[PDB]
Amino acid sequence: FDYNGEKVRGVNLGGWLVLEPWITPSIFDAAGAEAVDEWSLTKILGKEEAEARLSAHWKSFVSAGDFQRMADAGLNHVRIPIGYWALGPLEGDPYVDGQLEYLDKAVEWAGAAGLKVLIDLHGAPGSQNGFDNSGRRGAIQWQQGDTVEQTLDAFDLLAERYLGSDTVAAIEAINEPNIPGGVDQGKLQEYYGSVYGIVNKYNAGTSVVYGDGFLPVESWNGFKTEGSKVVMDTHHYHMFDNGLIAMDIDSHIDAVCQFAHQHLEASDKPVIVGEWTGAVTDCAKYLNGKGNGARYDGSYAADKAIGDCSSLATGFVSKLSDEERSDMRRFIEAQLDAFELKSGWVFWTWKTEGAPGWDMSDLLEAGVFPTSPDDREFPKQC
Ligand SMILES: OC[C@H]1O[C@@H](O)[C@H](O)[C@@H](O)[C@@H]1O
Ligand SMILES: OC[C@H]1O[C@@H](O)[C@H](O)[C@@H](O)[C@@H]1O
Ligand SMILES: [Cl-]
């Protein structure tokens, strides 16, 4: 795929092969209050029952028809999180495997629908970020002990399995390595070099995707600058920062444009906005972790409430008003046009149990998500 010269238009399959509480709360809640991440979920259930419940979800959550709907929506890419444990749980891990059979199907189904797949190693041994979505929330132990070597071992098998397919256009080293949370950048760059070498052992045609580690994406200038070969992944969200979450719709749109002009256009590499969304609040149930509240309504970090989370926590955008859907679409269109100034975009996420603004499958049916660059209800922003 020509990342240097063509626009990525994608969606993530979040919550599928790496489960997250906010994406599928029912599954976590069926295992009780202490099931707060895939680690704890699988530990609580035990191996046999975890395999049963998680495999039921792997099978039901995604079909070929999902991929066809993605292609019908004007997409060309699907980013697919997978955890290291899919390639072999480590000694003592509670995790169960079996995801690879489903990722095999996704590659087939994506190909059939004309889509490329970006495989994303989303969770590393020890946790590269302390997020629930790494598998295990609550400390960063990646880079301790043998965790990096174990990450490369899993990455190698992942690359070996998939990079023979032209459907698999790109592979991401690790999702959201958390530099400000204590991931060492120099060591991260060494892991990035090793990942590049693994990719080139199997298929030098495949692009290597590197997260910016929460640093400004342009700070990565002069590292592995190689045209289409090496693509930066930056994640752009407006509900995890006090300044952004306080904004009205116009200010949100301006901040999207500023981000594109000051950061995306400042990078010496292709840059995908590999996660972004339609929501402007952090109201979705469990978004900040199961058992944590929301900035928006004052129930996180002693933030001062801006509004209530009564409408935006759960459900489907049909529950909202025409004006609320309209503003949501305005924010989405601005992001599409801003992010296509650089190399494109990959929405988070395809499907949820009802998280207003976060669920592309919902937003498409509701007429909120555009289906082409020409599908614009509002003037072009940025
Ligand atoms: O917080 C929203 C989303 O952010 C993403 O970066 C993480 O990579 C996802 O796994 C998470 O659901
Ligand atoms: O990229 C999105 C991520 O941003 C981080 O700053 C937050 O701590 C995470 O909760 C959030 O998922
Ligand atoms: Cl960043």
Ligand code: NA
């Ligand atoms: Na909530």
